[PDB]
Design an enzyme around this catalytic site. Structure first.
Site, PDB file in Angstrom:
ATOM      1  N   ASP A   1       9.007  14.875  10.695  1.00  0.00           N
ATOM      2  CA  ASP A   1       8.633  14.555   9.315  1.00  0.00           C
ATOM      3  C   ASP A   1       7.118  14.704   9.132  1.00  0.00           C
ATOM      4  O   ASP A   1       6.484  13.872   8.501  1.00  0.00           O
ATOM      5  CB  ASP A   1       9.085  13.118   8.970  1.00  0.00           C
ATOM      6  CG  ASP A   1       9.124  12.840   7.472  1.00  0.00           C
ATOM      7  OD1 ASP A   1       9.150  13.808   6.682  1.00  0.00           O
ATOM      8  OD2 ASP A   1       9.142  11.641   7.087  1.00  0.00           O
TER       9      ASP A   1
ATOM     10  N   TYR B   1      12.902   4.426   3.310  1.00  0.00           N
ATOM     11  CA  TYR B   1      13.304   3.544   4.410  1.00  0.00           C
ATOM     12  C   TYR B   1      12.460   2.292   4.631  1.00  0.00           C
ATOM     13  O   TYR B   1      12.809   1.454   5.457  1.00  0.00           O
ATOM     14  CB  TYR B   1      13.397   4.337   5.714  1.00  0.00           C
ATOM     15  CG  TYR B   1      14.416   5.433   5.626  1.00  0.00           C
ATOM     16  CD1 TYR B   1      15.768   5.136   5.523  1.00  0.00           C
ATOM     17  CD2 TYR B   1      14.030   6.767   5.626  1.00  0.00           C
ATOM     18  CE1 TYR B   1      16.712   6.142   5.433  1.00  0.00           C
ATOM     19  CE2 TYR B   1      14.969   7.782   5.538  1.00  0.00           C
ATOM     20  CZ  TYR B   1      16.303   7.466   5.442  1.00  0.00           C
ATOM     21  OH  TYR B   1      17.227   8.479   5.351  1.00  0.00           O
TER      22      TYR B   1
ATOM     23  N   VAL C   1       0.813  -1.217   0.000  1.00  0.00           N
ATOM     24  CA  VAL C   1       0.000   0.000   0.000  1.00  0.00           C
ATOM     25  C   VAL C   1       0.846   1.267   0.000  1.00  0.00           C
ATOM     26  O   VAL C   1       0.341   2.338  -0.294  1.00  0.00           O
ATOM     27  CB  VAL C   1      -0.989   0.045   1.184  1.00  0.00           C
ATOM     28  CG1 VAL C   1      -1.898  -1.179   1.166  1.00  0.00           C
ATOM     29  CG2 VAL C   1      -0.229   0.135   2.508  1.00  0.00           C
TER      30      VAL C   1
HETATM   31  C1  LIG Z   1       0.532   4.478   1.678  1.00  0.00           C
HETATM   32  C2  LIG Z   1       0.555   4.097   3.167  1.00  0.00           C
HETATM   33  C3  LIG Z   1      -0.579   3.552   3.760  1.00  0.00           C
HETATM   34  C4  LIG Z   1      -0.562   3.203   5.105  1.00  0.00           C
HETATM   35  O1  LIG Z   1      -1.699   2.669   5.640  1.00  0.00           O
HETATM   36  C5  LIG Z   1       0.600   3.405   5.884  1.00  0.00           C
HETATM   37  C6  LIG Z   1       1.733   3.954   5.280  1.00  0.00           C
HETATM   38  C7  LIG Z   1       1.704   4.305   3.926  1.00  0.00           C
HETATM   39  C8  LIG Z   1       2.900   4.167   6.023  1.00  0.00           C
HETATM   40  O2  LIG Z   1       3.885   4.653   5.461  1.00  0.00           O
HETATM   41  C9  LIG Z   1       2.950   3.836   7.381  1.00  0.00           C
HETATM   42  C10 LIG Z   1       4.112   4.055   8.122  1.00  0.00           C
HETATM   43  C11 LIG Z   1       4.159   3.721   9.476  1.00  0.00           C
HETATM   44  O3  LIG Z   1       5.292   3.943  10.192  1.00  0.00           O
HETATM   45  C12 LIG Z   1       3.041   3.166  10.095  1.00  0.00           C
HETATM   46  C13 LIG Z   1       1.880   2.946   9.354  1.00  0.00           C
HETATM   47  O4  LIG Z   1       0.784   2.409   9.967  1.00  0.00           O
HETATM   48  C14 LIG Z   1       1.829   3.283   7.998  1.00  0.00           C
HETATM   49  C15 LIG Z   1       0.654   3.072   7.252  1.00  0.00           C
HETATM   50  O5  LIG Z   1      -0.336   2.581   7.805  1.00  0.00           O
END
Ligand SMILES: Cc1cc(O)c2c(c1)C(=O)c1cc(O)cc(O)c1C2=O
Ligand SMILES: [Cl-]
Length: 328
Positions: free
Chosen positions: A150, A44, A39
């Protein structure tokens, strides 16, 4: 420079709390979790919707790309410390691949609506509401001695159907320690505060408030992103062209910072532009006086002048959101 609030959170707390390098991970069972579909992805990590095969509940699986072990312990520690806070994504498990040693962080399921498609449909009230909810996440992590570093739309997941918000990707976040000199290479370029762009290393939680201000500006003005520079030098130019160079000179003099003769030549000279210069037919109403007053109090060169997350939450701009919450 030091933070004007929450400066002593890690001063009063046990080293156990903030000494992430001393963390020893307890790895769970990698087989508990199966990838369903990718998704997201970034420098990183790669992120997938997953399924917990034990309870058959959805989850998010974040597979970490090769990095220094210290960065991995840091994200884990911070997520553990913040787990349970308002609108903070919940880290539920940590696993890794035996052969490759590839780690995966397992999070509560979050059902994101892509911001590029979502933001155009947001109403005035939706903006006030989602920004208020984000502010809860930020005051919370700031109160727990942590800077996100960020904040950007990509890291604010919104399930618009359920009006749920989660602040995600704590991989650049850090513990705040009074006087500590931090790496300025954090945050996405469009959301970098002036302090990052002029190498002021002893910054604090207020960094997140600039990034939030950038997000807010992009929302109410319907300009993505609001400050659109192609590299860090250009990014400071784009900021100067709006906020004016007079304020920048005051800022730099206050913190005794010297600009590169190169960067300085690039920035040149600019008057401060009124926020209404950016009002137009696609956005004229999203841009009420309360919106402009609030925005103006976030986008200040001087990080020490910016609203705290707590102050921001109380601004009259949000008065209806507060009223609706209280009546529940
Ligand atoms: C496109 C996309 C959909 C997501 O649901 C997440 C992320 C990206 C995401 O980068 C992400 C990073 C994170 O550290 C925890 C998350 O639950 C996430 C995400 O849940
Ligand atoms: Cl955990």
């Amino acid at each position: 420079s030091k933070a004007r609030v929450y400066a002593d959170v890690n001063v009063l707390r046990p080293k156990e709390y903030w000494d992430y390098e001393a963390l020893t991970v307890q790895w769970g069972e990698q087989d508990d979790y199966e990838v369903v579909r990718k998704v997201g992805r970034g420098k990183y990590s790669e992120v997938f919707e997953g399924i917990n095969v034990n309870n058959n509940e959805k989850c998010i699986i974040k597979i970490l790309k090769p990095v220094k072990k210290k960065k991995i312990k840091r994200e884990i520690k911070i997520l553990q410390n913040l787990c349970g806070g308002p609108n903070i994504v919940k880290l539920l498990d940590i696993v890794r691949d035996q052969h490759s040693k590839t780690p995966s962080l397992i999070f509560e399921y979050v059902n994101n609506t892509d911001f590029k498609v979502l933001y155009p449909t947001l109403t005035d009230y939706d903006i006030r509401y989602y920004i208020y909810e984000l502010l809860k996440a930020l005051d919370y992590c700031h109160s727990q001695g942590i800077m996100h570093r960020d904040v950007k739309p990509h890291n604010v997941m919104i399930d618009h159907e359920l009006r749920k918000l989660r602040l995600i990707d704590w991989g650049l976040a850090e513990f705040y320690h009074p006087g500590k000199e931090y790496n300025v290479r954090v945050a996405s370029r469009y959301f970098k505060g002036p302090e990052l762009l002029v190498d002021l290393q002893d910054y604090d939680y207020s960094l997140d408030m600039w990034s939030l201000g950038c997000m807010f500006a992009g929302m109410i003005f319907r300009k993505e992103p609001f400050f659109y520079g192609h590299d860090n030098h250009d990014q400071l130019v784009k900021i100067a062209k709006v906020l004016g160079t007079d304020g920048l000179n005051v800022y730099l003099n206050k913190y005794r910072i010297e600009l590169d003769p190169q960067l300085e030549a690039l920035v040149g000279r600019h008057s401060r532009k009124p926020w209404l210069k950016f009002m137009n037919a696609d956005n004229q109403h999203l841009v009420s006086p309360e919106a402009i007053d609030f925005l103006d109090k976030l986008l200040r060169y001087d990080h020490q002048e910016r609203l705290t997350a707590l102050e921001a939450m109380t601004h009259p701009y949000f008065q209806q959101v507060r009223a609706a919450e209280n009546s529940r």
